[PDB]
Amino acid sequence: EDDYGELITDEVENGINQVLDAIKNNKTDKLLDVNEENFLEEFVNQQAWIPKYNFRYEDPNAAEIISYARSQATLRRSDDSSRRRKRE
Amino acid sequence: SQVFGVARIYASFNDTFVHVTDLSGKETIARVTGGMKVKADRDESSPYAAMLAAQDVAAKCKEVGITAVHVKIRATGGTRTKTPGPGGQAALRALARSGLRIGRIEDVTPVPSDS
Amino acid sequence: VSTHNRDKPWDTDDIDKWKIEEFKEEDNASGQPFAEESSFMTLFPKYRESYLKTIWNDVTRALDKHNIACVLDLVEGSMTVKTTRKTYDPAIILKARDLIKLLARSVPFPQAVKILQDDMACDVIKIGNFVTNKERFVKRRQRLVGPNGNTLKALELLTKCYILVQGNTVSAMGPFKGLKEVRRVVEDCMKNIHPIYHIKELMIKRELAKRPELANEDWSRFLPMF
Amino acid sequence: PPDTVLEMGAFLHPCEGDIVCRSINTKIPYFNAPIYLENKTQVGKVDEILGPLNEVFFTIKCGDGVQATSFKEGDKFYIAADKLLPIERFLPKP
Amino acid sequence: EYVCIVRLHDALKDEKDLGRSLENLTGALFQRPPLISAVKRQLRVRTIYESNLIEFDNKRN
RNA sequence: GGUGAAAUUCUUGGAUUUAUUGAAGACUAACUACUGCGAAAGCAUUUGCCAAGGACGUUUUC
C-alpha cells in the first residue's frame, strides 16, 4: 500500500511542473501542440500530502475521524439473536 | 374526472428521460429525451432541455388526456451514483408548471447489496 | 458519432440553460394538492441520536418553511419526511429525503440545511465494501483526510464542495461536477490510487480550463497519465 | 440518571400522542416526574393521573423524538423511586 | 348532580365502551382541577356516587 | 453511451427506456461500527444441525 506518491515520482513532478510553466507562459506553439492559490502552492511544493460552516476544514478538529462505541444505552429496540434464544 | 398515467423520469448526470406510460406499464403513451430538446451533448444534462422535454411530454399527455401523473424518479443506480441528475428536478417542476396533478412520489433507484 | 440525429434550431445559445427558475404556490396550474401522500424513511446510527434530539425542532422549522411534515421516532430509530396538503413543490420531498440522509450521515445541520436550496446537491459514497481488511480500510480512509486535513481542504479546493468522511460513508454537498469529481477521487482512493494523483490531475485540468485554446483541444496529451 | 427504577406502568392506549398506562405499582407518582425504560432511558414525563382507587391509570406526555405508536401492549415503563407518594396521603384525614 | 354532554374526537368501535368506562369511573376518583378553576391544581380524591348514560350517538359523537 | 470538451461502439432491423417470463453467476442495501468476535485471513437474510471458544467466578493429581 503506497502512501507517499510512489507513481508520481520526482521526475514526473518535474515534468508536470514544466508542462504547467509552459501552459502559464501561454505560448502559441505550446498551445497548438488569505488566498487559496497560495495554500495550494504551499501544499504542492512542500509535499503536504506526504505525512511527517462553509467547509469542513474551517471547523476545528477536522483532521481527526471521530470514533464511537459499538454499544450505547438507547431507546432503540434490539432484536435478540437466535443464539441467545437457543441458549435460553 | 381523473386520468392516471405514470410518468417515469430518468435523472442521470448525462441526460434526462421523461416517459409517460399507462398504469399497468404495458402500454407507453410517450417518451422524450434530453438530447431530443438540445443538439449539444453537454446540453443534455442542462435543466432547460429537461424542462422542454417535460413540456413536450405534458403536451402529449394532454393530447392523450392524462390529467394526473404518478412520478417515479430513477437515478443511475447500480455501481454508479444514486444522486438524481440536475434535470430531473427541473423536469418535475416543469410537469408541475404544465398543470397536471402530481400523484405519489417514490424513488425507484436500484441499490445493490454489494459489488 | 451521433448517427441519425435530427437538428435542433429551436435551441438558442444566448439562453442560459444552466439558469434555474424559482417556484411559487401559484406555479402549478392544477390548483389541487397531491392525490396520495408520499413519505421517505431513513435510519440513523445510534451515536447521532442525542444530537438529533437537540436539533429536530429546528429541522422542523426549516421544513415548516417548505410545508413538509417530519417525524423522528427513536424506537424504530427512523426519520420520515412526508408531503402535506399545503405542499406545492413536487421536488421538495426529494430534497427533504436528501436532508434526512445527510443528517443521518453526520453532516451538521447548519451545513445540511442548504440542501433545500435548488442549486445544492448531495452524494453519499459507500466505502465499506471496497476492501475487507480493517487496517487497509482505515489507512485508505486516512489518505482522504491526510495530515491536518490539508489534502481534504485541497479536495474542497478541487470541487468547492463540503466533504465529510464518517465511518463507511463520504458525504459531499455541492455542484454536480464537483460531486462527480469527488466520487472519482473517493472510489479511486478506496481502490488504493492515491488522492494526490487525482488532485494534481484536477489542478492541471483547471489550468487547462483557464485557457480556451487548451479547453478546445484534448487535455489528455498535456496532462500526465494516471 | 436515576440510581434505581421501579415498575410504574403498563402500556394501554397511545391516544393523542400520549401514553396511557395501567399503574402496576401501588403508589402515586409525582406530576411531571420523568418516566424511564429499564435501561434507565427517559421516554417522557407524567402528564395526568386518573382512574378509580382500585384501578389507577396515568398518562405520560412523551418527550420529543418519541412517538406513541412505536410501543406495543405489555410494555413496561419505569420511574425513579423518589418520585412516588403514598396513596393514603391523598385520602381524607380521619 | 349534573347532566353532561361529552364530545368524543373519534367514533368508538362499539357503543358499550362508553357505558363500561362510565361505570368504571363511578366511585372514588383521582382528579386535578383545571387551569380555569381559581383553586390550586392538586391531586384530590373525589367521589362520584352514581352515573347513568342517558344517550350516546356515534354519528353525532 | 461517456467526457472538461471529446472520442470508440449500439441501432428506425427498435439503439435507449418501461413491463413480464426463463436461465446463470454473485451479494445480503440502511441499522454499521479503527471500542464486538477471530491467532491471522476475515466476519450481520430466515430456519435448523455440528464442533470449538472469549471475558468472570470456584478451583486444579497441576
Author numbering:
A (entry chain I): 65 to 97, 212 to 230, 261 to 296
B (entry chain L): 11 to 125
C (entry chain H): 2 to 227
D (entry chain C): 33 to 126
E (entry chain A): 122 to 182
What are the paper's exact sentences on this?
Nucleolar 90S pre-ribosomes are well-described stable intermediates, composed of pre-18S rRNA, ribosomal S-proteins, U3 snoRNA, and ~70 assembly factors. We identify snR30 (human U17), the only essential H/ACA snoRNA in yeast, which binds with Cbf5-Gar1-Nop10-Nhp2 to a pre-18S rRNA subdomain containing platform helices and ES6 of the 40S central domain.
In contrast, the structural analysis of the Utp23-Krr1∆C3 isolate, that yielded more progressed but stalled 90S, revealed two distinct, but tethered particle populations: one was identified as the snR30 snoRNP complex, while the other exhibited a series of stalled 90S states. We observed an additional flexible connection linking the H/ACA snoRNP core and the platform module in our complex provided be the AF Utp23. Its unstructured C-terminus recognizes and binds to the snR30-ES6 three-way junction within the 3‘ H/ACA module through a conserved motif. Notably, a specific role during platform formation can be assigned to Utp23. We observed a class in our Utp23-Krr1ΔC3 dataset, in which the C-terminus of Utp23 was bound to the snR30-ES6 three-way junction, however, its PIN domain was not yet interacting with the platform module and helix h20 adopted a premature conformation. Accordingly, integration of h20 apparently requires the sensing of the snR30:18S hybrid and subsequent binding of the Utp23 PIN domain to the platform module. In agreement with this role of Utp23, the deletion of the interacting sensor motif of the Utp23 C-terminus (aa202-211) results in a substantial growth defect.
